[PDB]
Amino acid sequence: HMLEQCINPFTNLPHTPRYYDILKKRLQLPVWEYKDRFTDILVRHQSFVLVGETGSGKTTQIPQWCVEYMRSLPGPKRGVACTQPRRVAAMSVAQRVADEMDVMLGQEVGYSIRFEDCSSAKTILKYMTDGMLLREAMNDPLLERYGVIILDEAHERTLATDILMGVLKEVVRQRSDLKVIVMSATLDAGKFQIYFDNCPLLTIPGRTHPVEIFYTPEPERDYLEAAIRTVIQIHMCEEEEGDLLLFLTGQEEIDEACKRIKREVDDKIIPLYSTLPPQQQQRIFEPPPAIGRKVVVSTNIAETSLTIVVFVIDPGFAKQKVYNPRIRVESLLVTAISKASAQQRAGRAGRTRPGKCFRLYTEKAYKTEMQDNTYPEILRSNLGSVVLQLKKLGIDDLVHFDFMDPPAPETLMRALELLNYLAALNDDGDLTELGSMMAEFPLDPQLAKMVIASCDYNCSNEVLSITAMLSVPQCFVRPTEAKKAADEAKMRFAHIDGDHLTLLNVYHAFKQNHESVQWCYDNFINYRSLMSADNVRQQLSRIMDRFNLPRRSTDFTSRDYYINIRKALVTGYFMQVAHLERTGHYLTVKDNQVVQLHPSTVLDHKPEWVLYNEFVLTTKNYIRTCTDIKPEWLVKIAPQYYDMSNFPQCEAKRQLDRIIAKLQS
Amino acid sequence: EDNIGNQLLRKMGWTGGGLGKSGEGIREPISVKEQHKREGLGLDVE
């Protein structure tokens, strides 16, 4: 027990009237009935699991109680860390908790996402992404900056969360004072309990009303049409005042639906996705306007990360980034959700009062086709970045590393294979100096190697700009009703050698026109993407200075200016190359996937050899962001990958054999 | 397999089966069901 005078312990001044208005509300959250029982466990055990449904108040109240616990301990004031899988969740819940504690966001309460650290020396509670916390562990193996680490939303089983659970399980074997709390919205059969050595479990009862579930009589031919059909049928055939929540897979699918819903009803529509500006994102909370209603067309951001809604439309699909280690292909994919995911979507209708979830699929499709639980992300991800950070952390044995769900051995082979090709690991599996340096860049190992290697090509300034543009959302604005005008504006920045250099042109012209918003409107350029790219580039350049990596440019009047930049791209992306086939098709080297250039490319011709940044897997295979390259550069820059003694004998090797024979003439 | 990824995995002590502390991991990568355009869930079965 510590002396608590009715003042703000961070300013030694009385709290504001808003603090006590918010305090009255959150005292009614179901978690506050269990504060003593939470405290009794926290002060007697190192790790435990806390299960509570969405809206119980774990995310906002539990970290505040752990700050209370830290302030009572003697010694140097350590902080509290609470991880979130989604960067939007970390930012919004940090601003909310900052209001509840009557402090400025970025001061006592802050957030840390990739490329945006909103914290100071006063920060004692920080909501961060799970990826950022793992990043901090490389320079802080035991995470001694924190006394309590809270892994929230553990049921979503993101790759970074799974690795963190494996790292933290090793840290608590070496640090006795650290408290680890794993929080989940489902029980998951006590899996987290058994993993952390049968630790205690605290379950908060849910306060969710009954939810009626409606199944379609037959499967739907088009789930987007069924979603639009269901939205308008709810609007007219329902007399109870209420709001709508529609789950779609991506941004393009959302803006398309919001457009058609507006057109057919005209005869409040609210989008919500991650890259949507926060000005439009906060519109999900504004009041609704014949009953006037609110329809929120969102992604699975609203499945558990936040709460808003009496009627939910569940098409049953989400977009996942999957990795096929057989063909070394990583792509975003639309796939059916799990029965656990479906229950979480339906549970969002029973928040205010009893609601209804309209599942756009049959009951037999729910029971006989949908998996019970969604595959852990670690079983369908490229592990190269995670392996590199673990080796930097000092974990050498990744075979016997205690994963909750171990990845397939072939997926780990591809990760070790990738890092060795980039010279991040030597032939003994040891981290090299180049690999240790690459691990400090918050980028894919391909991008980190590309940036470092470009110094030798005297174009690190230009690769740094391109890297920043590849690290932000789409910079080209392409409205559906104005494709020709948008494409015409994009072609003003087009470089004849492809898309990577076109991104360079956009950044250069953005800077030389002084970050003008009107200039972005004139050229259909996304102003927010470019400001973000500018911020990302500054931070990456600060990492360059720390390692004394020179930032250099080639004479622009020379032909070597663009040739050196394209050579530098090969240093990182030599594994993502396609070869033009006689009849106009492209074949990826080695893996022999049939692909074609994404329609968004600025290339007005088909180069014989193209390097691509992204594999797009729809009805056909598309490669996006493509650059013309010379095949001679492939054999000279990355000979360990273009090993002709081991290269598969397809048509790509036939052309490469001629070049290598000509080199030895 | 003479792949460099296999060799580095064998040099970590990998002996054949699944990964993990007890060798209990999956021994083959999983497969994701392909989604044809915007076909509703369950349309493939019929």
Side-chain angles (χ1 to χ4, degrees):
Chain A
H1 317 273
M2 291 286 301
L3 175 58
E4 276 181 323
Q5 291 170 152
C6 53
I7 59 172
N8 196 334
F10 309 108
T11 66
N12 290 336
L13 292 171
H15 286 285
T16 62
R18 187 189 64 175
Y19 167 88
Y20 295 112
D21 294 334
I22 302 178
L23 182 56
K24 291 180 181 182
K25 300 182 178 182
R26 54 195 188 99
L27 284 181
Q28 306 178 226
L29 291 166
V31 285
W32 272 88
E33 301 191 27
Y34 291 77
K35 174 156 184 172
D36 289 323
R37 282 171 280 188
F38 169 82
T39 302
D40 289 329
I41 293 168
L42 173 67
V43 299
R44 288 172 174 83
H45 302 266
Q46 177 155 43
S47 309
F48 66 100
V49 175
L50 194 148
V51 172
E53 311 204 312
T54 304
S56 62
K58 329 178 307 294
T59 310
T60 57
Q61 311 304 301
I62 298 291
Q64 294 186 60
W65 297 348
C66 296
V67 172
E68 194 183 48
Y69 165 81
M70 290 306 302
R71 184 158 287 268
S72 68
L73 299 178
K77 288 207 180 307
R78 299 189 212 257
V80 176
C82 182
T83 60
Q84 297 292 327
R86 302 158 188 270
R87 56 177 283 273
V88 144
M91 296 180 65
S92 72
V93 77
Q95 176 65 71
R96 179 185 303 174
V97 172
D99 291 349
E100 300 187 358
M101 293 178 55
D102 235 10
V103 303
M104 298 263 300
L105 182 61
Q107 298 303 310
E108 285 76 19
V109 176
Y111 66 82
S112 179
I113 63 178
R114 190 164 70 106
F115 298 136
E116 183 148 291
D117 183 18
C118 184
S119 59
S120 59
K122 299 182 187 174
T123 304
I124 38 80
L125 170 57
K126 196 163 65 179
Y127 289 91
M128 51 207 308
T129 59
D130 46 9
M132 280 308 300
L133 186 64
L134 179 71
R135 179 77 53 182
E136 294 191 0
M138 306 181 317
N139 294 7
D140 189 6
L142 304 184
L143 292 169
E144 283 142 353
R145 223 169 253 164
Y146 308 103
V148 176
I149 290 168
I150 302 174
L151 305 182
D152 196 6
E153 300 289 80
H155 59 286
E156 285 179 337
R157 299 294 305 280
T158 59
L159 174 59
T161 289
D162 275 14
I163 303 303
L164 273 180
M165 280 189 297
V167 172
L168 291 180
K169 187 173 180 181
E170 193 73 24
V171 173
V172 298
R173 291 203 317 103
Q174 305 173 35
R175 261 186 75 189
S176 68
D177 64 306
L178 176 58
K179 303 293 187 176
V180 174
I181 301 172
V182 165
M183 299 199 307
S184 177
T186 69
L187 183 57
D188 269 11
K191 201 172 184 178
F192 314 97
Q193 252 188 324
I194 303 178
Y195 184 73
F196 276 95
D197 299 332
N198 302 289
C199 62
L201 170 72
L202 184 56
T203 301
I204 317 295
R207 291 190 187 177
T208 292
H209 299 257
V211 180
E212 290 198 51
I213 308 303
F214 297 92
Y215 294 96
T216 58
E218 65 173 7
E220 295 293 331
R221 301 268 202 177
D222 185 304
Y223 71 79
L224 178 65
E225 277 198 10
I228 299 172
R229 185 192 70 243
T230 308
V231 161
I232 63 102
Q233 260 172 205
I234 296 175
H235 191 208
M236 310 177 186
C237 300
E238 287 283 353
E239 302 174 349
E240 299 177 350
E241 288 262 352
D243 302 324
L244 282 64
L245 186 62
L246 171 59
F247 287 101
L248 291 185
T249 62
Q251 158 186 341
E252 298 175 335
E253 187 171 274
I254 283 178
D255 287 6
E256 163 82 281
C258 294
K259 167 188 179 182
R260 297 171 65 179
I261 292 180
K262 169 160 294 182
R263 289 239 211 178
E264 299 191 19
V265 171
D266 285 9
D267 296 354
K268 302 297 183 180
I269 305 182
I270 303 173
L272 176 68
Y273 37 92
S274 313
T275 62
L276 196 58
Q279 181 183 195
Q280 273 66 71
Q281 286 184 346
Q282 275 187 350
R283 290 223 302 161
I284 68 173
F285 292 158
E286 67 188 52
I291 301 301
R293 300 177 178 273
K294 248 173 56 180
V295 48
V296 172
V297 187
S298 169
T299 84
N300 55 11
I301 297 172
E303 181 162 320
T304 45
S305 74
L306 50 85
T307 181
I308 320 177
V309 172
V310 203
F311 309 105
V312 170
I313 305 97
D314 181 18
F317 289 106
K319 190 175 292 185
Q320 302 174 185
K321 177 163 55 140
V322 311
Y323 176 72
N324 192 330
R326 313 278 192 172
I327 59 181
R328 276 168 292 183
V329 167
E330 185 172 19
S331 182
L332 292 165
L333 242 186
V334 173
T335 189
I337 68 181
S338 68
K339 295 210 277 293
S341 297
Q343 288 179 353
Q344 290 297 334
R345 297 188 178 188
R348 306 285 70 79
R351 178 81 169 109
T352 294
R353 44 193 160 106
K356 309 182 183 187
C357 181
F358 301 85
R359 296 176 178 173
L360 305 181
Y361 42 94
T362 65
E363 185 190 6
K364 72 176 304 302
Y366 171 79
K367 293 153 65 177
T368 71
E369 181 152 0
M370 291 176 55
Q371 307 177 200
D372 302 334
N373 290 111
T374 164
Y375 272 134
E377 202 178 67
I378 192 178
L379 305 173
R380 51 177 167 89
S381 303
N382 187 319
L383 302 185
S385 186
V386 144
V387 168
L388 179 56
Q389 299 173 56
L390 287 177
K391 299 245 64 175
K392 170 82 172 197
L393 247 172
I395 301 175
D396 288 324
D397 193 341
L398 295 191
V399 167
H400 309 101
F401 184 71
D402 195 352
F403 306 96
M404 179 169 298
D405 284 302
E410 305 175 22
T411 306
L412 181 50
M413 292 180 197
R414 295 304 202 193
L416 299 171
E417 169 191 312
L418 171 69
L419 296 174
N420 182 263
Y421 285 157
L422 300 172
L425 303 174
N426 60 22
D427 294 355
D428 298 323
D430 300 327
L431 185 71
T432 66
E433 296 182 10
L434 169 66
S436 176
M437 193 152 45
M438 287 168 54
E440 305 264 15
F441 287 87
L443 310 163
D444 299 3
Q446 292 94 336
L447 287 176
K449 173 58 184 290
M450 191 173 86
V451 170
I452 301 175
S454 67
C455 297
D456 308 324
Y457 295 82
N458 292 334
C459 63
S460 50
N461 281 327
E462 284 69 37
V463 171
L464 209 59
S465 303
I466 295 177
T467 300
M469 298 289 288
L470 295 164
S471 302
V472 297
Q474 253 286 339
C475 66
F476 295 105
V477 175
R478 189 172 198 257
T480 284
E481 54 280 346
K483 293 189 180 73
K484 185 176 183 174
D487 290 353
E488 178 65 49
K490 173 177 62 180
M491 292 307 294
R492 300 166 199 159
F493 308 94
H495 196 281
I496 178 189
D497 284 328
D499 298 318
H500 288 89
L501 294 180
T502 293
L503 292 174
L504 187 59
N505 284 338
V506 172
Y507 179 69
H508 282 177
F510 175 79
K511 296 294 294 180
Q512 76 181 9
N513 286 264
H514 305 298
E515 295 89 18
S516 170
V517 175
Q518 181 60 51
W519 177 92
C520 289
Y521 277 126
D522 291 350
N523 298 276
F524 287 81
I525 293 295
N526 191 319
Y527 171 77
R528 228 177 73 89
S529 301
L530 262 292
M531 291 296 287
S532 184
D534 212 15
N535 171 44
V536 171
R537 195 195 184 277
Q538 302 174 15
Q539 300 176 30
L540 289 178
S541 64
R542 282 192 271 268
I543 304 176
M544 303 285 283
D545 293 343
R546 205 226 303 186
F547 292 134
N548 294 123
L549 299 173
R551 291 140 65 190
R552 287 171 174 166
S553 298
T554 285
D555 196 327
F556 182 83
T557 66
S558 173
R559 69 181 281 272
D560 295 351
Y561 184 84
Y562 288 119
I563 292 174
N564 281 338
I565 300 168
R566 291 153 59 204
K567 290 180 177 181
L569 303 175
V570 183
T571 65
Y573 283 87
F574 55 91
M575 296 178 68
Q576 305 188 182
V577 171
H579 170 239
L580 174 66
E581 191 256 356
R582 187 194 71 88
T583 50
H585 312 266
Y586 278 100
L587 284 158
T588 64
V589 295
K590 290 213 173 186
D591 302 319
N592 267 283
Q593 301 289 124
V594 188
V595 304
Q596 55 187 103
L597 302 182
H598 195 271
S600 63
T601 188
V602 306
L603 288 170
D604 64 348
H605 76 288
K606 291 179 178 177
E608 294 190 5
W609 297 81
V610 294
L611 178 147
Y612 62 94
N613 181 75
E614 175 186 11
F615 201 105
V616 178
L617 201 154
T618 164
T619 318
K620 313 167 189 176
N621 293 331
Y622 294 100
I623 46 170
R624 181 154 61 185
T625 311
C626 304
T627 292
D628 188 331
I629 60 170
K630 297 184 183 175
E632 296 84 8
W633 303 346
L634 297 175
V635 308
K636 296 179 179 186
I637 297 175
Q640 187 187 356
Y641 185 73
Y642 292 90
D643 175 356
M644 295 305 106
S645 74
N646 253 22
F647 213 84
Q649 291 180 339
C650 54
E651 186 61 23
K653 172 157 187 172
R654 247 179 295 270
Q655 239 195 282
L656 297 174
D657 283 352
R658 179 193 64 85
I659 293 146
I660 273 164
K662 170 115 183 303
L663 286 172
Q664 303 180 51
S665 60
Chain B
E1 202 159 351
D2 67 323
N3 192 340
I4 306 95
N6 175 284
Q7 300 175 8
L8 300 176
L9 194 56
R10 282 185 157 189
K11 299 209 178 196
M12 287 188 180
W14 186 61
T15 49
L19 301 173
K21 194 173 71 277
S22 308
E24 78 278 18
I26 61 174
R27 298 179 178 179
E28 289 172 356
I30 63 104
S31 306
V32 288
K33 184 190 180 66
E34 180 72 12
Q35 174 58 29
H36 301 291
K37 298 143 284 294
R38 304 213 176 91
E39 288 189 338
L41 179 47
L43 185 55
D44 275 356
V45 171
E46 292 182 353

